[PDB]
Design a binder for this molecule. Structure first.
Ligand SMILES: CCCCCCCCCCCCCCCCCC(=O)OC[C@H](COP(=O)([O-])OCC(O)COP(=O)([O-])OC[C@@H](COC(=O)CCCCCCCCCCCCCCCCC)OC(=O)CCCCCCCCCCCCCCCCC)OC(=O)CCCCCCCCCCCCCCCCC
Ligand SMILES: CCCCCCCCCCCCCCCCCC(=O)OC[C@H](COP(=O)([O-])OC[C@H](O)COP(=O)([O-])OC[C@H](COC(=O)CCCCCCCCCCCCCCCCC)OC(=O)CCCCCCCCCCCCCCCCC)OC(=O)CCCCCCCCCCCCCCCCC
Ligand SMILES: CCCCCCCCCCCCCCCCCC(=O)OC[C@H](COP(=O)([O-])OCC[N+](C)(C)C)OC(=O)CCCCCCCCCCCCCCCCC
Ligand SMILES: CCCCCCCCCCCCCCCCCC(=O)OC[C@H](COP(=O)([O-])OCC[N+](C)(C)C)OC(=O)CCCCCCCCCCCCCCCCC
Ligand SMILES: CCCCCCCCCCCCCCCCCC(=O)OC[C@H](COP(=O)(O)OCCN)OC(=O)CCCCCCCCCCCCCCCCC
Ligand SMILES: CCCCCCCCCCCCCCCCCC(=O)OC[C@H](COP(=O)(O)OCCN)OC(=O)CCCCCCCCCCCCCCCCC
Ligand SMILES: *C(=O)CCCCCCCCCCCCC
Lengths: 62, 455, 155, 49, 171, 540, 122, 63
């Protein structure tokens, strides 16, 4: 009863809200729509496995 | 609907056979049982109404009106038992019997399948209401009844008998399928006014509205609750049933009356900024809110009917709570003067919190169903014309102001020095406020049951 | 309370005026009613149309929030001349000069906004030039068609 | 509690799920998502001129 | 779960994190703390409750409405057949409403998921949305609050007369 | 995915939990304001993790978690939008609110209704985070009307006073005149785009969008106290000082600016809306900062200060630079809440004295308040590399270098000089000079609540502009090539305002009595605008 | 800011309008003028989600700066050189826009001298 | 007023806590049904067309 505030107001609401979002909200279509991550030349895709080919050598300015 | 009419009539031996101290408790208990029973009316479908018999049917328009009607009776019995504690016991049972008979007329007014049975029940509701207002009212011509029945009820009677002889039936279910287009003529024009003007007066319409800020003042609390909560909505229910037959003449005959409402909700609202009587302020607010129901019925779009039935249910709840708050002050200072008793949050904090909630739902604070009805009516009238939004929005300025001015005049400021009979809030009064407000707040969590036949 | 203290019709005879001034609890010579045209004021006094801000703020009032005494005939718009609402108090600047200054400042500022909108300020540069046919596919161009080539040049 | 568990009040949920059938039916057979005509224009006689 | 045919999505391709700097970010440590402290107890509770579901398996069904004759092949003022046509048209009207809602869900999800390139990448969803809203507007708009199968058929006949006159004056 | 949206909703549910605590009570609380201050501290710490994983990638999402109502084509879902605007406004609002409530444990310590005060202040915070996390116009209207109603309830906090209820009803009237335009905008989007959701509004991309943008500009004119509808914000200093510090500086009054920033893809395709916003914002930032030059009530001066900064925000929305306007919000919040907090410390030390003509000698009498108010005034004027440098000067750098109304630019520069004028007016009459207050000096600022509450916003006013301005991704291209008289414009005109107003301040020690002309009587009577329209329009 | 007075208080016939320019051909005065070379591929910035204001002829430095700003977390000050590269390339693009404006000013002065010599000759 | 609020909390929770615990026990133990296609020749009852068990009991018993 010294960190009861971090338990009853954080951890139990994180448990309840993550349960509600995982097993009732994401089970429904288009409720949590996440924007796709920004792809750069030089990335390695975790899903496909293909490394994005980089950009051209620059027309140097300095 | 026979499972609701028979307990309503068994409330007559339940109120006359009871003991001398038991005729409030028994009637309140069993009327709350009937009000809990009333939720079986929500067996509604997206295509077909809940058609019980040849006489009775209940779609999603009549269902919230029925639930509000059967909920209003225990609240009127809680409201009216204080000031009748000095009344004779037999006249006390007469008052409760008039309320039960009025409920009996209303619950089969809203479920009348056939239109002339609707008319007979509709004009039968006026007799217990007039008995209650004239007998258990406080103060002292009568020309309002005559002007009502000339421009109203008997033109509606001749109109419905004419529809009976032309179409062959006044069943609303048959008239859904045998409706004919009503062309431009003078016969159809006076036919349209004969069908509409009785409900126009019963809303009330602006210019025909002056009967109401006197009938609310000359009433007891139960009379004011049943007037502003249900009896003003008989006009809206009758209009939503009768505008089926009245097409497409309404598409050019709704033009005058909409003006009378679109300016009327500007005028009466501003009249609410210049009132000295609290109960008349609630009365003119009721006129200003029913003006939008008139507009939304006359423009006859789906969003307008959804907003109008939401506004009818929300306004029944809100106006009944405001009249019960005015009752709670009238039973302490014995005067309806709004500027007399001030600063009452310093004395009655929970009652001032109920005043705050009632004024917030009066000015349509979202996500209340007041704002849902108000907002959908404003959307449909913006679709009607893009100028009316100004006349809507100016209204939604003034509807804030007198909602909070009434909150500032009575509940704020320095308390009145020469008034020392301000008792603490009785448990009955706060129970009455909470049974008005908690259904009104809970309907914000699921509003689709109060959005009519075409949600 | 009874009948002969409530407001009645407009007075005609001066003894009715004196009885009404005794009724409204005021002097007979300061008793002046509203003009008889049929607006429905009756025998009600024309109070001098000053608000409750100009009433004595230090005085021991019966109603200190309204600054008013018992039995004194209230103004017809006593609900309107409250200290939450329209005042009658004097300002150190006259009303007409305030109207002139406010209207002139608003009109002159909006006219100068119109003049500056007619005459914009800008930078000594050209337009921002964009690749791929001035961003045809990025601005929502359909891929079945081909636009005119928007080709920019080095400088 | 009773209003919270009304059995598909005025069949909206059904109408979502039924919609989830029909779009799925007309992504497979190449039919457009909704016709401009509600009924079949073959079974409508027109007033001639 | 749902059907990925009626709710289409492009494949979510995330890149593997390549930290250029040496500093350990708090996001991965809070992710693993979330996976230990939060994700596993919620998962075990859901496993126990899902076992308790599967100990009594029972099914509900989607109600199937067979086609009845429409308002066109109903005789005039015959309520026993035009009632069935009206309920048919009302159920189809509500299902068409929910189809338009599904296409709105697709359009909003495409716009958010594409982010800034939404005007480029969601031209197909915008075109399907324009098709289904044009169809809904030709099918049900301006029927009013007392809409019926008769009013919809009268609107369709007036639209067909306008289209027939437009095609005939073109030839 | 599982962490971001979870902590997003945990912040909001954590803010709603003390409302259930104050409503489910029987006993007398063991310092419920300490409970709400600890709760908002924890909600700030909770909301910082989605901010960090937005700084890392740029991960935006939408939580459409509760399907609420389907009106035949309108699926009103409880829909939250976590983009750049939510991720950068929610932790700033929580940090400012946590500082305001630890200030409020001291300023409102003798109140027997302190529980109702913190309940109303937390209800305001809940409604504002409804307002800035909203994805449809209905939920945004809920948050909008919620901050309007909590504005009413927190202006009329001492409800026995007639002027407090007067200012509350005035604030309601001007915000409902804004609500006319907002409901006009909702009506236009429902009838022409069939939506209130922001995604479909941005996707359908309307061209004839003059009417909905005029509705949104009228909503912002009501809410952000722009010209025509400003006077409720000078009236709104009647309430408590944490009310005017939290709500009417940093959290409520930016909501119309936040509404026009939220609708930047529609305003960037309309030159007419940009021109109307530019003209109205230049008008506001001239007029309100000019009316600040002649006041003596310190809360009136800082109210005209924050309204002038809102007019500057309206200008930099009108030049089609929305992210600079939003950075000016997130910058302005720290030091303007701190300036109201230091003014309230001066008020409470001098026994409820708000008039700067009875102040002075507070350089060494209130040294921590002196230090923090000087840092706040410098960050107001655009001192280099304080927090107010990292947006406001950049605004000028894009207000010069664009196809712009020139008179609006010139009024923006005149307003920039006027800010320095009333800032050194505040420093001269309040902290400088000699004591003019009464004789029993009860001056004290030794409470750890007050020290820590001003201290955290002072760390904010020193570092947060740098930290936030370096943590954003670039959503625009910064104009960084300009001539040297045009790069050095805002700093030079600010210093000219400093020097001219030091001349104005050194005129006061001369023993010469001058009659005030029409300029001082014009500005001192609030540009004559609250005099006529509060007497003539309710009369008719 | 001299061009404001030269377009408003002087004559307007020789100062180029901001809205409709260049009013001249691209090679009117340019023999073998090369086209601008684009460095960033269109799909590489379609996958970089860049603002359409930022999808100009120099967004490749911006792509490098955003890859830096993502990768160097939490050290938010470890991408100053990529920022200065992108700002220097924006500076060069602004200088090219100034060259466009000055080319238009000198061609309008050329047209003024041309029409004055044609009027004084014929 | 506080006596009213104590009575209000008590009389709401007096059947709210059994209803919340009962719905919790139904959602843990008995639980939500699963969507399926109709068997070849099987006729479902009307209360077997609904997903939640309390909705099934309402459609069977009352409706
Ligand atoms: C709580 C008691 C409080 C006091 C009691 C009195 C309460 C008041 C009186 C009420 C009387 C009844 C009134 C009518 C309501 C009836 C119920 C109802 O209709 O509920 C509706 C709705 C539907 O319920 P349902 O129909 O039963 O569910 C259908 C499914 O088929 C069901 O799906 P399922 O079967 O799959 O789910 C089963 C579910 C059970 O289902 C339920 O419980 C739902 C039914 C009860 C709902 C009661 C609702 C009452 C009101 C709640 C809200 C207000 C509360 C007060 C205010 C709070 C602060 C604001 O099981 C669980 O939830 C168990 C998991 C628990 C997770 C937490 C712990 C995990 C880790 C544990 C670690 C330790 C062990 C590890 C090892 C284990 C090894 C074995 O229920 C809810 O919404 C529940 C409330 C919470 C939802 C999430 C809340 C967070 C959302 C956040 C974002 C949105 C808000 C944004 C705000 C922004 C700022 C403004
Ligand atoms: C189906 C299951 C549902 C479960 C969840 C329940 C849903 C909500 C139900 C209603 C909740 C409020 C009820 C209490 C307020 C009225 C009485 C009062 O003053 O009590 C104060 C008292 C504590 O104060 P006190 O110091 O002891 O005495 C008062 C003082 O003397 C002096 O008083 P004061 O001035 O200091 O305090 C008054 C203060 C004054 O504050 C205000 O007036 C400010 C409020 C307006 C601005 C802020 C909100 C703006 C809108 C945003 C929120 C809604 C959407 C949020 C979602 C995200 C965005 C979409 O208001 C409050 O504290 C009330 C907070 C909740 C307000 C709800 C909305 C009212 C605003 C007007 C209508 C708005 C549209 C409808 C929204 C409906 C949402 C469900 O509280 C209690 O004793 C509570 C007793 C238990 C109440 C049970 C309520 C449920 C009854 C239903 C039974 C059947 C279902 C089972 C559910 C059981 C749940 C436990
Ligand atoms: C009806 C017409 C006549 C009107 C008067 C009637 C009087 C008679 C009264 C009869 C009983 C009551 C009838 C109406 C009941 C309405 C309630 C209801 O059933 O709802 C169903 C709704 C159903 O919503 P739903 O549509 O999502 O339901 C999902 C469907 N099931 C359950 C089957 C899976 O219930 C809820 O929404 C409950 C949700 C949980 C409880 C509420 C949580 C939030 C509360 C606020 C949290 C804090 C937020 C911040 C606020 C801060 C302070 C401002
Ligand atoms: C604090 C106590 C909480 C409960 C603690 C004890 C229980 C254990 C902890 C876990 C929680 C319970 C299990 C998970 C929850 C149930 C999951 C489920 O099936 O939910 C069914 C549904 C989900 O919605 P749905 O889409 O499935 O059903 C809606 C019904 N139809 C589709 C017909 C419309 O309900 C909920 O989840 C309700 C949650 C509401 C939360 C927010 C309330 C805000 C109230 C605002 C009112 C006004 C809004 C106006 C504006 C709206 C936007 C425009
Ligand atoms: C993008 C476009 C932008 C356009 C901007 C310009 C358009 C708006 C023009 C101005 C409109 C608002 C100003 C006029 C009305 C102001 C009323 C008001 O605020 O009154 C305040 C007054 C008390 O204030 P005060 O006296 O200053 O307080 C000192 C303390 N004793 O309080 C009172 O006296 C109380 C009064 C109560 C009764 C009021 C009755 C009249 C109500 C008028 C509603 C106006 C509706 C406008 C609708 C517009 C539709 C488009
Ligand atoms: C940023 C750089 C700020 C410092 C450089 C500019 C200083 C300046 O303008 O000085 C002029 C003047 C001081 O000169 P004066 O007051 O006449 O000297 C007598 C006693 N000091 O006036 C001042 O120094 C007052 C203005 C100071 C503004 C500082 C913030 C900018
Ligand atoms: C050419 O001079 C046009 C520049 C833009 C319009 C004039 C701006 C004048 C104010 C900026 C410089 C101020 C220096 C103290």
């Amino acid at each position: 009863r010294h960190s009861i505030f971090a338990f009853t107001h954080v951890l139990i609401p994180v448990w309840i809200i993550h349960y509600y979002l995982k097993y009732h909200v994401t089970t429904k279509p288009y409720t949590i729509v996440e924007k796709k991550p920004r792809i750069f030349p030089g990335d390695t895709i975790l899903e496909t496995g293909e490394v994005i080919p980089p950009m051209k050598e620059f027309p140097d300015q300095h | 609907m026979l499972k609701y009419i028979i307990p309503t009539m068994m409330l007559m031996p339940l109120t006359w056979l009871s003991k001398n101290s038991m005729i409030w408790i028994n009637t309140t208990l069993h009327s709350l049982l009937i009000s809990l029973t009333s939720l079986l009316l929500l067996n509604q479908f997206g295509d077909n109404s809940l058609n019980f018999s040849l006489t009775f049917f209940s779609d999603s328009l009549s269902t919230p009106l029925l639930i509000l009607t059967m909920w209003l009776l225990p609240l009127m019995l809680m409201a009216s038992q204080h000031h009748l504690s000095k009344e004779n016991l037999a006249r006390k049972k007469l008052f409760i019997s008039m309320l039960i008979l009025l409920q009996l007329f209303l619950i089969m007014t809203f479920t009348a399948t056939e239109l002339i049975f609707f008319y007979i029940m509709f004009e039968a509701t006026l007799v217990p209401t007039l008995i209650i207002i004239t007998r258990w009212g406080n103060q002292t011509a009568g020309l309002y009844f005559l002007f009502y029945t000339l421009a109203g009820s008997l033109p509606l009677l001749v109109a419905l008998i004419y529809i009976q002889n032309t179409m062959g039936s006044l069943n609303f279910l048959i008239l859904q399928y045998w409706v004919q287009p009503m062309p431009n003529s003078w016969s159809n024009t006076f036919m349209w006014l004969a069908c509409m003007m009785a409900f126009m007066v019963k809303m009330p319409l602006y210019g025909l509205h002056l009967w109401l800020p006197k009938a609310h003042v000359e009433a007891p609390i139960a009379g004011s609750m049943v007037l502003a909560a249900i009896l003003l909505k008989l006009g809206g229910y009758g209009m939503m049933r009768i505008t089926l037959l009245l097409n497409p003449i309404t598409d050019f005959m709704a033009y005058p009356f909409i003006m009378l409402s679109l300016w009327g909700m500007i005028m009466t609202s501003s009249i609410c900024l210049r009132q000295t009587d609290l109960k008349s302020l609630i009365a003119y607010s009721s006129v200003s809110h029913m003006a939008l129901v008139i507009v939304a019925i006359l423009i006859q779009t789906p969003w307008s009917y959804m907003g109008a039935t939401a506004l009818m249910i929300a306004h029944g709840l809100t106006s009944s709570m405001l009249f019960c708050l005015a009752n709670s002050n009238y039973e302490r200072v014995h005067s309806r003067t709004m500027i007399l008793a001030r600063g009452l949050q310093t004395l009655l904090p929970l009652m001032a919190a109920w005043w705050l909630l009632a004024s917030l739902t009066n000015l349509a604070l979202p996500p209340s169903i007041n704002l849902i009805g108000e907002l959908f009516v404003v959307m449909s009238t913006f679709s009607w014309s893009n100028i009316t939004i100004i006349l809507m929005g100016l209204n939604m300025v003034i509807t804030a102001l007198y909602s909070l001015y009434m909150l500032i005049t009575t509940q704020r400021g320095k308390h009145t020095h020469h008034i020392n009979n301000i008792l603490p809030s009785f448990t009955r009064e706060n129970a009455l406020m909470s049974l008005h407000m908690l259904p009104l707040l809970l309907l914000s969590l699921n509003p689709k049951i109060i959005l009519g036949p075409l949600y | 309370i009874t009948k002969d203290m409530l407001p009645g019709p407009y007075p005609k005879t001066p003894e009715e005026r004196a009885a009404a001034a005794k009724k409204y609890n005021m002097r007979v010579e300061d008793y002046e009613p509203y003009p008889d045209d049929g607006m429905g004021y009756g025998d009600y006094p024309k109070l001098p149309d000053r608000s409750q801000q100009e009433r004595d703020p230090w005085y021991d009032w019966d109603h200190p929030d309204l600054r008013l005494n018992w039995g004194e005939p209230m103004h017809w718009d006593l609900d309107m001349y409250i200290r939450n609402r329209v005042d009658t108090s004097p300002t150190p600047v006259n009303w007409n000069l305030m109207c002139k200054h406010l209207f002139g400042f608003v009109a002159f500022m909006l006219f100068m906004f119109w003049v500056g909108e007619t005459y914009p300020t800008y930078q000594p540069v050209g337009p921002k030039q964009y690749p791929y046919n001035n961003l045809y596919l990025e601005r929502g161009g359909d891929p079945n068609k081909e636009p005119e080539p928007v080709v920019h040049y080095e400088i | 509690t009773f209003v919270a568990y009304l059995p598909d009040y005025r069949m909206q949920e059904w109408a979502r799920r039924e919609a989830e059938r029909l779009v799925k039916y007309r992504e497979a057979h190449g039919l457009p998502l909704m016709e401009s005509n509600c009924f079949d224009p073959s079974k409508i006689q027109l007033p001639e001129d | 779960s749902w059907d990925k045919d009626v709710y289409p999505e492009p494949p979510r391709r995330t890149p593997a994190p390549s930290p250029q700097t040496s500093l350990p970010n708090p996001i991965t440590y809070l992710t693993k703390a979330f996976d230990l402290l939060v994700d596993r107890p919620v998962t075990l509770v859901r496993e126990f409750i899902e076992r308790q579901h599967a100990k009594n398996k029972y099914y509900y069904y989607h109600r199937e409405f067979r086609r009845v004759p429409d308002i066109t092949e109903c005789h005039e003022k015959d309520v026993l057949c035009m009632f069935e046509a009206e309920m048919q048209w009302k159920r189809d009207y509500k299902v068409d409403q929910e189809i338009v809602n599904i296409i709105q869900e697709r359009l909003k999800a495409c716009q958010q998921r594409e982010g800034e390139s939404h005007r480029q990448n969601c031209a197909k969803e915008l075109q399907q949305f324009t098709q289904v809203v044009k169809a809904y507007q030709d099918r049900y708009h301006d029927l009013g609050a007392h809409y019926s199968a008769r009013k919809c058929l009268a609107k369709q006949k007036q639209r067909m007369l306008a289209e027939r006159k437009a095609t005939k004056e073109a030839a | 995915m599982n962490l971001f949206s979870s902590l997003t909703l945990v912040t909001l549910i954590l803010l709603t939990m003390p409302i259930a605590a104050i409503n489910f009570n029987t006993h007398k609380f063991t310092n419920y304001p300490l409970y709400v201050k600890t709760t908002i501290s924890c909600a700030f710490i909770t909301s910082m993790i989605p901010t960090m994983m937005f700084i890392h990638t740029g991960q935006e999402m939408i939580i459409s978690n509760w399907h609420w109502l389907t009106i035949q084509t309108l699926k009103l879902s409880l829909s939250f939008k976590m983009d750049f605007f939510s991720m950068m406004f929610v932790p700033v609002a929580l940090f400012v609110t946590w500082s305001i409530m630890e200030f409020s444990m001291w300023y409102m310590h003798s109140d027997p209704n302190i529980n109702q005060f913190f309940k109303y202040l937390l209800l305001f915070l809940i409604t504002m985070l409804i307002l800035v996390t909203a994805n449809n116009l209905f939920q945004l209207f809920i948050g909008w009307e919620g901050v309007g109603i909590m504005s009413f309830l927190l202006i009329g906090w001492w409800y026995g006073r007639t002027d407090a209820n007067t200012a509350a009803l005035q604030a309601i009237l001007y915000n409902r005149i804004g609500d006319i335009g907002f409901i006009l905008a909702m009506a236009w989007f429902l009838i022409n785009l069939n939506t209130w959701d922001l995604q479909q509004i941005f996707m359908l991309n309307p061209n004839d969008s003059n009417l909905p943008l005029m509705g949104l500009i009228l909503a912002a004119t009501g809410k952000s106290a722009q010209f025509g509808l400003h006077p409720w914000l000078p009236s709104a200093m009647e309430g408590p000082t944490p009310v005017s510090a939290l709500l009417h500086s940093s959290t409520m009054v930016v909501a119309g600016i936040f509404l026009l920033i939220r609708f930047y893809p529609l305003t960037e395709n309309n030159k007419f809306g940009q021109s109307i916003m530019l003209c109205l914002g230049a008008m506001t930032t001239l007029f309100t900062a000019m009316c600040a030059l002649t006041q003596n009530d310190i809360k009136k001066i800082i109210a005209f200060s924050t309204s002038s900064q809102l007019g500057l925000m309206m200008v930099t929305i009108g030049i089609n630079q929305p992210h600079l306007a939003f950075l000016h919000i997130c910058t302005h919040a720290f030091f303007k809440a701190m300036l109201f907090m230091c003014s309230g410390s001066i008020i409470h030390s001098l026994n409820d004295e708000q008039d700067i003509r009875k102040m002075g000698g507070l350089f060494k009498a209130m040294p921590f308040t002196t230090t923090a108010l000087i840092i706040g005034s410098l960050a107001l004027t655009g001192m280099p590399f304080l927090t107010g440098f990292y947006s406001k000067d950049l605004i000028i750098e894009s207000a010069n270098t664009s196809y712009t109304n020139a008179w609006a630019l010139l009024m923006t520069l005149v307003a920039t000089s006027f800010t320095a004028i009333y800032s050194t007016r505040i420093i001269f009459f309040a902290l400088l000079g000699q004591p003019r207050f009464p004789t029993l000096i009860n001056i004290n600022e030794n409470n750890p609540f007050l020290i820590n509450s001003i201290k955290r916003l002072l760390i904010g006013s020193l570092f947060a502009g740098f930290i936030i301005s370096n943590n954003i991704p670039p959503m625009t291209i910064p104009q960084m090539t300009m001539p040297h008289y045009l790069k050095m414009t805002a700093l030079t005109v600010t210093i000219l305002g400093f020097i001219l107003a030091l001349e104005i301040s050194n005129t006061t020690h001369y023993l010469k009595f001058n009659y005030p002309s029409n300029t001082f009587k014009f500005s001192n009577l609030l540009g004559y605008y609250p005099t006529i329209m509060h007497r003539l329009t309710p009369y008719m | 800011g001299a061009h404001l007075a030269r377009r408003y208080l002087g004559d307007a016939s020789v100062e180029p309008e901001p809205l409709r320019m260049p009013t001249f051909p691209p090679d009117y005065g340019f023999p073998e003028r090369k086209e601008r070379e684009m460095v960033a591929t269109q799909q590489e910035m379609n996958d970089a989600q860049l603002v359409l204001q930022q999808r100009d002829y120099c967004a490749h430095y911006l792509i490098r700066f955003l890859k830096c700003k993502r990768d160097s977390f939490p050290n938010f000050l470890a991408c100053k050189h990529e920022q200065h590269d992108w700002d220097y390339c924006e500076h060069l693009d602004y200088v090219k826009r100034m060259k466009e404006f000055e080319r238009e000013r000198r061609l309008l002065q050329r047209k003024k001298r041309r029409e004055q010599r044609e009027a004084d000759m014929a | 007023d506080k006596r009213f609020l104590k009575l209000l909390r008590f009389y709401i929770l007096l059947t709210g806590i059994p209803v919340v615990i009962g719905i919790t026990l139904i959602n843990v133990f008995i639980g939500e049904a699963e969507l399926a296609e109709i068997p070849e020749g099987y006729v479902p009852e009307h209360w077997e067309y609904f997903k939640h068990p309390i909705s099934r009991w309402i459609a069977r018993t009352f409706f």
